[PDB]
Design an enzyme around this catalytic site. Structure first.
Site, mmCIF file in Angstrom:
data_model
loop_
_atom_site.group_PDB
_atom_site.id
_atom_site.type_symbol
_atom_site.label_atom_id
_atom_site.label_comp_id
_atom_site.label_asym_id
_atom_site.label_seq_id
_atom_site.Cartn_x
_atom_site.Cartn_y
_atom_site.Cartn_z
ATOM 1 N N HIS B 41 0.820 -1.223 0.000
ATOM 2 C CA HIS B 41 0.000 0.000 0.000
ATOM 3 C C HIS B 41 0.858 1.279 0.000
ATOM 4 O O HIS B 41 0.312 2.363 -0.204
ATOM 5 C CB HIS B 41 -1.093 0.036 1.093
ATOM 6 C CG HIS B 41 -0.603 0.104 2.511
ATOM 7 N ND1 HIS B 41 -0.861 -0.920 3.412
ATOM 8 C CD2 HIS B 41 0.054 1.090 3.156
ATOM 9 C CE1 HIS B 41 -0.326 -0.530 4.557
ATOM 10 N NE2 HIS B 41 0.246 0.667 4.446
ATOM 11 N N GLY B 143 2.069 5.832 10.023
ATOM 12 C CA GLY B 143 3.517 5.881 9.854
ATOM 13 C C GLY B 143 4.197 4.591 10.311
ATOM 14 O O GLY B 143 5.340 4.317 9.914
ATOM 15 N N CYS B 145 3.314 1.424 9.586
ATOM 16 C CA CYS B 145 3.252 0.360 8.593
ATOM 17 C C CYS B 145 4.629 -0.038 8.133
ATOM 18 O O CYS B 145 5.515 0.816 8.021
ATOM 19 C CB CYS B 145 2.354 0.753 7.427
ATOM 20 S SG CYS B 145 0.609 0.898 7.883
HETATM 21 C C1 LIG Z 1 0.428 2.769 8.064
HETATM 22 O O1 LIG Z 1 1.614 3.444 8.435
HETATM 23 C C2 LIG Z 1 -0.136 3.517 6.866
HETATM 24 O O2 LIG Z 1 0.441 3.762 5.824
HETATM 25 N N1 LIG Z 1 -1.434 3.849 7.159
HETATM 26 C C3 LIG Z 1 -2.384 4.317 6.155
HETATM 27 C C4 LIG Z 1 -3.315 3.232 5.669
HETATM 28 C C5 LIG Z 1 -3.024 1.889 5.878
HETATM 29 C C6 LIG Z 1 -3.893 0.891 5.478
HETATM 30 C C7 LIG Z 1 -5.092 1.235 4.866
HETATM 31 O O3 LIG Z 1 -6.015 0.344 4.388
HETATM 32 C C8 LIG Z 1 -5.720 -1.048 4.493
HETATM 33 C C9 LIG Z 1 -5.408 2.590 4.664
HETATM 34 O O4 LIG Z 1 -6.637 2.832 4.112
HETATM 35 C C10 LIG Z 1 -6.992 4.196 3.843
HETATM 36 C C11 LIG Z 1 -4.512 3.570 5.050
HETATM 37 C C12 LIG Z 1 -1.702 3.648 8.529
HETATM 38 C C13 LIG Z 1 -2.859 3.930 9.271
HETATM 39 C C14 LIG Z 1 -4.004 4.747 8.723
HETATM 40 C C15 LIG Z 1 -2.922 3.480 10.588
HETATM 41 C C16 LIG Z 1 -1.850 2.812 11.136
HETATM 42 BR BR1 LIG Z 1 -1.937 2.242 12.937
HETATM 43 C C17 LIG Z 1 -0.709 2.555 10.414
HETATM 44 C C18 LIG Z 1 -0.641 2.975 9.092
#
Ligand SMILES: *[C@@]1(O)C(=O)N(Cc2ccc(OC)c(OC)c2)c2c(C)cc(Br)cc21
Ligand SMILES: *[C@@]1(O)C(=O)N(Cc2ccc(OC)c(OC)c2)c2c(C)cc(Br)cc21
Lengths: 304, 304
Positions: B41, B143, B145
């Protein structure tokens, strides 16, 4: 979202752990620059630890009697000295993995990460607090002495604790990195009373703010209180008296959530007088006091 | 003595964290050998994440669109590919800090350490479990992820988890290091139901053995039970059914303490039917299920 008992990343500290051997005793040492810091009881035998004369015991030891091993490389000891309850062994090589560091003496109620080590090797990391009675409720077995407690501010490791002993009550005692014991403890196998422990009030309130920020709101009520009324309650339930300084340090949490400190105090008063009623807050059925206001702010904002 | 929720030392994993940027999105990557692993993503924008066509989105990207930064040094991307929900970016340099590692898919109920990271920088480490419903109750903000979950066997890091998303219920979901999601989750901003979670029965029993080894014995009783009778109780209190395999894995704890597994099951049955009665076990007022029998054995023996 989510709230965890989080430790600092232990990498910078792992690079400092060495094994210190003196005669038949082995414990952990901390190699920073060209100095290895370890508990002075490394020079004792089981018979000595009843009432050891450390000055006399250290006189029977030479630089070559201190065997320092970093992983699997032997360090050459060129100097040795005692400072309070720590031995400082000067080695001929500066640790190439020495992070930027400070030696700090923490206050009771403050938190820190512990890197538990055995034979100079790291086994685990956990977050804990210096109890108001200067003990730490850690997880340490024989061989863990010399394990350190620390905090990390961006790239700087502030060492605050070195593990020295286990009290008959299973709690732990140790020193700052200048060898000064936290609390009334001495490095002897003697009768040692850990004082009356209390709950760190400002930390419980900081954890209540962490709960609101994360969705756990059931404990919020329609009441407020005064610092004096709250302190009568805190006294009754063996909680540390809340001060204006504590109220001030809760300011950023008060501002983020829009819940005045005294309104959160009235929630804590109701929780103390009524219990949780079979409910939980941040996955806990008791009032958690090992998160400072700074820890909550850091975890809830994402400081690296 | 003492019992703590202990994480693995995070050093070996800290050395692998990098920052991956693609267009305007930044998350964490894992640099092992000449490959950087991150959630796919990273190639999406907020509009794309409704129903993204990953194959199509990856086609608009070239090696030079993936900006990989290790601390403050830029890595040259020479290849890119998608494997399930992860992107594997081939870089021209092997990570000199690559520890010995394996990619493993953990089972529900198993535990692991999480090194939370933001912008490729480590912020904290904590111990958690893969819930029976394939979610993790972590602490992750936007952040985070690309943060990974791992276990360490002497010198080998077994990576088991990569963080991908937060469910509307505040729990976390992610993949193994081959990009296969744990559970039924998909990397979309859609309606996603985390299944019914249960309590990890073998882990609670392992934690009851850790309590006896450490002095907390009040819950031991004069009763025994059968696997079938215990399972009727476990079913009623939404606990995982105990199997003969679970009984067998509790064997070393049964041998150390001299408390038969079924006798410990009768203690757990009484705790489930009667509650703690305002008491605590290892400083907790609830039944803890995030310590496996292996974790208890390791912590209680001192494995480094
Ligand atoms: C991680 O750092 C992200 O990039 N992130 C945004 C995000 C991640 C996953 C998804 O859908 C599966 C979406 O959908 C809009 C956005 C995020 C978020 C919002 C929350 C966390 Br905790 C970590 C991360
Ligand atoms: C630590 O690793 C030890 O060396 N160690 C032995 C020990 C420590 C301190 C004292 O008295 C102050 C004594 O007295 C006999 C022995 C030890 C022990 C026993 C427990 C733990 Br936990 C860590 C260490």
């Amino acid at each position: 979202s989510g709230f965890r008992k989080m430790a600092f990343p232990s990498g910078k500290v792992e690079g400092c752990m060495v094994q210190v051997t003196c005669g038949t005793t082995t414990l952990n040492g901390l190699w920073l620059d060209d100095v290895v810091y370890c508990p002075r009881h490394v020079i004792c035998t089981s018979e000595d630890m009843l009432n050891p004369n450390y000055e006399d015991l250290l006189i029977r030891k030479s630089n070559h009697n201190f065997l320092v091993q970093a992983g699997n490389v032997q360090l050459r000891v060129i100097g040795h000295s005692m400072q309070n309850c720590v031995l400082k062994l000067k080695v001929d090589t500066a640790n190439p993995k020495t992070p930027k560091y400070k030696f700090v003496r923490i206050q009771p109620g403050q938190t820190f990460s512990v890197l538990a080590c055995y034979n100079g090797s790291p086994s685990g990391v956990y977050q804990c607090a210096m109890r108001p009675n200067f003990t730490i409720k850690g997880s340490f077995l024989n061989g863990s002495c010399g394990s350190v407690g620390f905090n990390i501010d961006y790239d700087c490791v502030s060492f605050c604790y070195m593990h020295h002993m286990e009290l008959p009550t299973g709690v732990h005692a140790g020193t700052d990195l200048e060898g000064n014991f936290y609390g009334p403890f001495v490095d002897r196998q003697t009768a040692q009373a850990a004082g009356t422990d209390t709950t760190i009030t400002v930390n419980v309130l900081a954890w209540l703010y962490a709960a609101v920020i994360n969705g756990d709101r059931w404990f919020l009520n329609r009441f407020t209180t005064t610092l004096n009324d709250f302190n009568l309650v805190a006294m009754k339930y063996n909680y540390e008296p809340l001060t204006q300084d504590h109220v001030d340090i809760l300011g950023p949490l008060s501002a983020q959530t829009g819940i005045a400190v005294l309104d959160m105090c009235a929630s804590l008063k109701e929780l103390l007088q009524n219990g949780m009623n079979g409910r939980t807050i941040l996955g806990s059925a008791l009032l958690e006091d090992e998160f400072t206001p700074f820890d909550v702010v850091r975890q809830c904002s994402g400081v690296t």
